[PDB]
Symmetry: C2
Subunit: 165 residues, 2 copies
């Protein structure tokens, strides 16, 4: 069980940091034949749910992450129509739609260019993208309760929410 691996890598504090999380996820086999997650992707995964700002992730938060990772993995396989093991612009656009985001062509362009390596978006980068989209949206939503699609941010708040990710 992935939960058994969590316990095995948790260490003395019963919670995982980026490095421990990377070990747990790699042992889980969630990445299949794709490359394991990078330390950076695991760090952002933690930042996404680090409500207490401790740089670590508790088990209950991990259950939420695991659920999200499996949904994102299915989306990846769904949109990877050519089975390249990489997500191209039109595929990523589809995945973004599957996740519920309504983004402009330019934003999509920016995202593809930012996450591409040698021309392609591999699983690790794809997941990192999904994580950041969710983390940034969580922050934005706290300033957009009416869900109007706009929000005011004081500079300091803006940096706190974005620099933490």
């Amino acid at each position: 069980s992935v939960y058994t691996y969590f316990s095995a890598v948790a260490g003395q504090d019963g919670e995982v940091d980026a490095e421990e999380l990377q070990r747990c996820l790699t042992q889980s086999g969630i990445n299949g034949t794709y490359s394991p997650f990078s330390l950076e992707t695991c760090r952002i995964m933690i930042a996404m749910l680090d409500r207490d700002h401790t740089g670590k992730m508790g088990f209950n938060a991990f259950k939420e992450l695991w659920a999200a990772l499996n949904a994102w993995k299915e989306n990846f396989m769904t949109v990877d129509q050519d089975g390249s093991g990489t997500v191209e612009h039109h595929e990523l656009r589809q995945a973004i739609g599957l996740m519920g985001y309504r983004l402009s062509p330019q934003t999509l362009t920016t995202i593809v260019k930012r996450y591409s390596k040698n021309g392609r978006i591999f699983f690790d980068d794809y997941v990192a993208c999904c994580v950041k989209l969710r983390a940034l949206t969580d922050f934005f939503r706290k300033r957009d309760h009416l869900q109007q699609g706009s929000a005011n941010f004081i500079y300091d708040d803006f940096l706190q929410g974005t620099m933490a990710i």
Copy 2:
């Protein structure tokens, strides 16, 4: 010159991607006895100046980056008053002030937690921090029309500016 190193790694399009930039900067000696830059840091250095959204860096952008890196390098030497080769909370506070940014102790704490390892911020992470602070502050300033320290953002705009870095 550093531009000689740029020309040595530049692609046939006269630009460099994150990996080619990494090689150029390693040859430049901007780090001295410090470590080379991580791929992630080089990727955001490119993003910071990717005004034409090509995911690559041309000569003009590199010259701008080189100037910024030297500014950040000099600031690093200035604030690392105990010669630890690393920047601690108090020292980063000074550096952020030298960069012309005014943030709260709370935001400072968020930044230190994000980039420090055992209380120390090493060169690569320090530069990554400087890059993101500049990029996000410039993005915020563009929307802060009245220059009052607060700005309203359309959701998609917010995501493009933040996902870009």
